[PDB]
């Protein structure tokens, strides 16, 4: 439990340890989806003003 808490507080160690196709795919999908959601909100709000 002590080791896990120390590892949790250090994200850099996680990045070095977590390297894989599954990890990168999940991270990229999250970032792309987050950007897309912001774009949808921006477009809808822009078009609803008029």
């Amino acid at each position: 439990k002590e080791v896990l808490e120390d590892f949790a507080e250090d994200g850099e160690k996680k990045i070095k340890l977590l390297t894989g196709k599954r990890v990168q795919l999940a991270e990229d999908l999250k970032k792309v989806r987050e950007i897309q959601e912001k774009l949808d909100a921006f477009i809808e709000a822009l078009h609803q003003e008029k």
């Binding site: 999908l29 792309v32 950007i35 003003e49």
Partner: protein, 345 residues
């Protein structure tokens, strides 16, 4: 409002894509100015608040600032990394904000340099403000200051070129009306980098000082009508940044500029078009053109992002159909639970 989301999208795009592969697909406003050319005054006039540090001829802008103007209940400025609100309606808070911005400029400076290439995103809210994103850049110096790094001029040029790399970026050149176009290199660089002129906009400062210097009307008319300059831009505008004092209020400068142009003999003689002057006309034209380009670009980007996300999802199904996508934190939680299970086993 809308521009707040657009500014946020640009910030996340820069973080997600370090390179300009995707950042070069959206319109942007690029501002380049010389030393003591009134670039700070013009940016302050558009923002309707003096938020940048002022110095007696010294380039206080030691780091680029991404100033965003949006719609808000009160005229306040908020940092991206800090939630401490600063009220621009009070002069005391304005002075504190200027000191905070200068402190942030010095903190971001790396070792061995004087001007850092990092850009700080600042959201300046206010009722009735134009919905657009502005970029502040250090002034171009003909002679390198002894107190600055030898590559400060090169860093400023590189930052301006990187910003201008976007084919949809709008160029906003700022110079001095008392200096001829042949004595400044910035105007030559702007013309060279935009042979078409489909997005170049030129802003001339200290027009009142130039008029008080008995400037030739032919040169002013040619600059405004795009005759002397070989490049053919969409249009040219002239604004007055006051008498040059670093303590003058924005409201007094704007009122004086309007009165000066109303009583100016050049405008009543029809030498210069009445809609080619004042900051209000320039701001409205820039905002409408920038917004229309943004609308078209964002539609294309949204479709591309949706298709790209679909490809990523399809790859996930093909490779891992019976698994669930989790972020770095969730994977850590799953890994530790498996460890505890093995301990029990």
């Amino acid at each position: 409002s809308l521009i707040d989301m657009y500014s946020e999208v640009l910030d996340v795009l820069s973080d997600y894509d370090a390179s300009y592969n995707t950042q070069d697909h959206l319109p942007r406003v690029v501002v380049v100015g010389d030393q003591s050319a009134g670039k700070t005054s013009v940016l302050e006039m558009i923002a309707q608040a003096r938020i940048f540090p002022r110095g007696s001829g010294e380039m206080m802008t030691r780091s680029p600032v991404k100033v965003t103007l949006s719609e808000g209940p009160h005229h306040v400025a908020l940092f991206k990394d800090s939630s401490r609100e600063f009220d621009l309606t009070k002069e005391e808070d304005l002075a504190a904000l200027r000191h905070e911005i200068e402190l942030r400029m010095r903190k971001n400076v790396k070792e061995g340099c004087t001007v850092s290439p990092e850009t700080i995103s600042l959201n300046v809210k206010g009722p009735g403000l134009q919905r657009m994103v502005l970029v502040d850049l250090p002034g171009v110096i003909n002679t390198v200051t002894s107190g600055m790094a030898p590559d400060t001029k090169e860093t400023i040029f590189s930052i301006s070129k990187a910003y201008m790399q976007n084919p949809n970026a709008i160029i906003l050149c700022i110079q001095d009306g008392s200096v001829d176009a042949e004595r400044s290199i910035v105007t030559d660089l702007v013309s060279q980098m935009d042979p078409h002129g489909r997005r170049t906009i030129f802003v001339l400062t200290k027009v009142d000082l130039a008029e008080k210097n008995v400037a030739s009307p032919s040169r002013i008319q040619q600059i405004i009508e795009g005759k002397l300059f070989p490049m053919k831009a969409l249009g040219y505008f002239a604004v007055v940044t006051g008498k040059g004092n670093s303590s003058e209020s924005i409201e007094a400068i704007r009122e004086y500029e309007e009165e000066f142009f109303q009583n100016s003999k050049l405008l009543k003689t029809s030498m210069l078009k009445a809609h080619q002057v004042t900051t209000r006309n320039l701001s409205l034209a820039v905002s409408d053109c920038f917004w229309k380009m943004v609308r078209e670009s964002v539609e294309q980007q949204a479709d591309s992002f949706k298709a790209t996300r679909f490809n990523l999802e399809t790859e996930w199904k093909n490779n891992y159909p019976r698994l669930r996508e989790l972020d770095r934190n969730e994977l850590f939680e799953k890994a530790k639970n498996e460890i505890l299970d093995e301990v029990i086993s």
